[PDB]
Amino acid sequence: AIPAFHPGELNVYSAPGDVADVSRALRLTGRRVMLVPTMGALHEGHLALVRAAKRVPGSVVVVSIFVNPTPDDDLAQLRAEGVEIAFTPTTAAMYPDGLRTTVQPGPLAAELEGGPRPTHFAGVLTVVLKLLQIVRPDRVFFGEKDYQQLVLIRQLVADFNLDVAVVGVPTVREADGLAMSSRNRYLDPAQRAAAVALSAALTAAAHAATAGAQAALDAARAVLDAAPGVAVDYLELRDIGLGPMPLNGSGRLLVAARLGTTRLLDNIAIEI
Amino acid sequence: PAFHPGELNVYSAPGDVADVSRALRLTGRRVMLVPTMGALHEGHLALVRAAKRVPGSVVVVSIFVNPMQFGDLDAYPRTPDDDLAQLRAEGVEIAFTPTTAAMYPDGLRTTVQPGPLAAELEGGPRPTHFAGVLTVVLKLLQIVRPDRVFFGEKDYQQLVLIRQLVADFNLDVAVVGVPTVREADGLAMSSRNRYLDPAQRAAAVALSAALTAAAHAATAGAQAALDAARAVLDAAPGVAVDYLELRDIGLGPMPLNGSGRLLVAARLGTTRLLDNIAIEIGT
Ligand SMILES: COc1ccc2c(c1)cc(C(=O)NS(=O)(=O)c1ccc(C(F)(F)F)cc1[N+](=O)[O-])n2CC(=O)O
Ligand SMILES: COc1ccc2c(c1)cc(C(=O)NS(=O)(=O)c1ccc(C(F)(F)F)cc1[N+](=O)[O-])n2CC(=O)O
Numbered sequence: 300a301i302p303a304f305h306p307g308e309l310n311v312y313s314a315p316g317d318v319a320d321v322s323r324a325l326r327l328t329g330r331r332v333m334l335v336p337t338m339g340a341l342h343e344g345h346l347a348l349v350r351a352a353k354r355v356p357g358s359v360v361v362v363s364i365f366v367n368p369t370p371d372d373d374l375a376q377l378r379a380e381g382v383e384i385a386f387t388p389t390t391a392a393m394y395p396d397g398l399r400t401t402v403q404p405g406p407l408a409a410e411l412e413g414g415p416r417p418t419h420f421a422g423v424l425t426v427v428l429k430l431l432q433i434v435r436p437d438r439v440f441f442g443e444k445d446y447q448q449l450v451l452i453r454q455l456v457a458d459f460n461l462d463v464a465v466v467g468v469p470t471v472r473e474a475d476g477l478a479m480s481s482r483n484r485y486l487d488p489a490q491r492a493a494a495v496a497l498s499a500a501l502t503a504a505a506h507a508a509t510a511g512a513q514a515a516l517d518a519a520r521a522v523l524d525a526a527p528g529v530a531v532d533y534l535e536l537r538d539i540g541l542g543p544m545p546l547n548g549s550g551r552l553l554v555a556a557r558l559g560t561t562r563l564l565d566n567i568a569i570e571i
Numbered sequence: 572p573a574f575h576p577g578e579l580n581v582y583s584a585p586g587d588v589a590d591v592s593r594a595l596r597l598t599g600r601r602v603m604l605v606p607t608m609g610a611l612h613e614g615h616l617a618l619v620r621a622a623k624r625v626p627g628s629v630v631v632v633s634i635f636v637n638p639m640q641f642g643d644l645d646a647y648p649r650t651p652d653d654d655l656a657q658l659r660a661e662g663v664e665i666a667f668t669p670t671t672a673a674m675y676p677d678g679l680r681t682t683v684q685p686g687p688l689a690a691e692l693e694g695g696p697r698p699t700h701f702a703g704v705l706t707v708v709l710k711l712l713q714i715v716r717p718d719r720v721f722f723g724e725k726d727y728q729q730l731v732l733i734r735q736l737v738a739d740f741n742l743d744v745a746v747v748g749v750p751t752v753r754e755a756d757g758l759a760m761s762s763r764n765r766y767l768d769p770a771q772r773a774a775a776v777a778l779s780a781a782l783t784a785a786a787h788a789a790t791a792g793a794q795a796a797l798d799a800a801r802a803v804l805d806a807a808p809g810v811a812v813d814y815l816e817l818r819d820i821g822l823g824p825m826p827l828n829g830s831g832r833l834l835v836a837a838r839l840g841t842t843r844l845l846d847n848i849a850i851e852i853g854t
């Protein structure tokens with residue numbers, strides 16, 4: 300028997316087998332299954348992931364809420380957007396044999412964010428793989444804010460021959476350009492004001508780039524240097540797959556910085 | 572890609588087999604995967620026959636000597652003509668024969684990291700071996716998307732780790748272990764048996780004799796079982812034992828209770844032979 304599912308309502312499932320069965324049944328009825336993986340505390344960046352998923356014709360949207368080891372609020376937000384499935388497993392349900400077979404990323408995981416957090420991406424890719432196998436979506440949606448993460452997921456998909464489409468959704472930003480993040484609330488007024496330097500550096504670089512890569516890097520560095528209390532961890536221009544930047548062509552510029560105790564990240568498309 | 576039913580269709584491109592598989596599954600057929608490294612013998616054909624018995628099945632047999640799980644690699648026997656001939660004789664409809672470049676276009680990048688079992692027994696001296704195995708098996712399962720996948724029980728550790736992969740990454744496939752096919756004297760079928768000279772082939776009977784001796788001795792307890800098997804191994808000329816271990820059936824971090832598996836590995840000249848058996852303690 301398929302678990303109960305009411306079209307056009309929010310249906311909540313905490314058991315991996317239940318969401319798996321419902322998803323399978325829905326695919327067999329027409330629908331194109333979309334997955335938006337989250338850690339809850341839904342914000343406007345997640346709204347953008349959900350909206351992108353909703354507009355695929357014949358979509359049913361699954362939003363997972365899972366913290367790797369309000370809910371009331373999150374669920375009402377999903378209802379308001381017309382999401383039909385929430386998948387809300389316990390740690391036990393995801394890891395019933397505990398930590399055992401895992402995903403080992405390629406060497407990109409050791410670079411950039413992998414310096415301060417050398418095992419973080421192993422966890423991310425392990426959980427993303429599991430969610431993909433459980434839900435079996437046609438398309439999975441991620442923000443571009445965590446660009447290295449996104450690139451690693453694309454590697455996962457290519458490397459293990461997964462049959463899902465990975466969709467990256469442009470970063471949602473505050474009115475001054477600060478990339479949305481659960482961390483922004485912690486900034487005091489001076490830090491919040493300084494934090495605009497990250498996005499201003501990157502947008503300056505993207506426009507400076509007609510004058511070449513060095514001009515782009517030097518423009519972003521100059522903007523970051525205008526900001527007090529912004530400790531830059533890295534500022535790197537790479538190809539779009541995060542290898543070495545080619546002489547000209549498309550790239551990505553990534554920054555990370557610490558403001559007081561808070562780490563912020565941002566990145567942007569660059570054309571040289 | 573063309574699929575002619577009742578004939579052997581050989582596909583190298585992963586995309587071709589993936590498409591044929593998906594199309595079959597959508598027309599009601601259930602897809603069975605028999606993943607092998609070639610050099611096929613009657614034990615592999617037992618896998619195929621098992622798979623064939625599943626009502627409405629279509630059987631895919633993969634043949635791929637996976638470089639990521641190894642002069643070792645160059646030494647592995649390759650007999651593709653015999654292999655395809657045997658499959659056609661068994662009525663298999665799909666053989667999947669990918670190139671190394673098709674499987675590993677980006678070389679080694681994302682991989683499967685097994686749990687701690689991979690560092691024991693066969694894995695202790697070979698620390699990446701089972702990573703290589705689980706990585707290729709994951710890939711073959713994603714490509715083919717079978718309903719069921721079939722392995723022999725002879726490489727029991729490998730089988731258990733595959734069960735762990737399946738569980739741990741929520742794969743939607745049933746894993747089927749098929750009991751080891753044996754020569755008339757008891758010797759486990761293996762693509763490595765061809766490397767036994769006549770004397771070593773005679774002596775090799777000691778593995779299976781030891782294991783069956785232990786399974787019967789076990790009414791007298793674990794010590795009697797192990798000591799029976801050791802005695803048979805010790806009486807055999809030219810058999811050098813690498814390990815003989817009685818473990819719980821999952822080979823996991825739990826002591827032996829009523830049901831165990833007794834594992835042996837031993838070298839005959841340069842040939843390393845494995846075997847195992849179910850053991851019931853006190854029966
Ligand atoms: C489209 O615009 C944006 C802008 C920022 C975004 C997002 C979208 C999404 C996130 C985000 O979810 N961050 S998250 O750390 O909660 C997270 C972490 C891991 C995973 C993954 F699936 F990959 F494991 C997903 C999410 N997630 O919540 O989409 N964040 C950053 C944040 O949540 O702080
Ligand atoms: C059927 O004919 C052949 C020919 C060569 C073979 C094999 C079979 C199997 C291997 C091989 O390496 N198997 S193995 O990678 O599973 C292996 C071999 C020896 C050890 C040992 F524990 F002894 F070190 C471990 C493994 N292993 O399971 O990691 N090799 C390569 C080799 O022995 O170097």
Ligand SMILES: COc1ccc2c(c1)cc(C(=O)NS(=O)(=O)c1ccc(C(F)(F)F)cc1[N+](=O)[O-])n2CC(=O)O
Nearest residue numbers: 403638639640679682683698699700701702703704706
């Ligand atoms: C206990 O002694 C050892 C000795 C070497 C080990 C390890 C343990 C573990 C690794 C290891 O995982 N290396 S690796 O990440 O490059 C790796 C991972 C997976 C695979 C495989 F293909 F098999 F899936 C191969 C490698 N590798 O080493 O080529 N390596 C090889 C290394 O670090 O280069």
Ligand SMILES: COc1ccc2c(c1)cc(C(=O)NS(=O)(=O)c1ccc(C(F)(F)F)cc1[N+](=O)[O-])n2CC(=O)O
Nearest residue numbers: 606607608614615617723725726729750751752761762
């Ligand atoms: C039902 O009866 C049997 C009896 C023995 C079997 C099989 C079936 C299947 C195999 C076998 O080797 N299958 S396999 O080609 O996928 C394979 C090849 C090499 C390795 C190695 F250890 F070298 F890595 C393992 C497997 N495997 O079976 O886990 N073998 C073992 C062998 O040929 O040594």
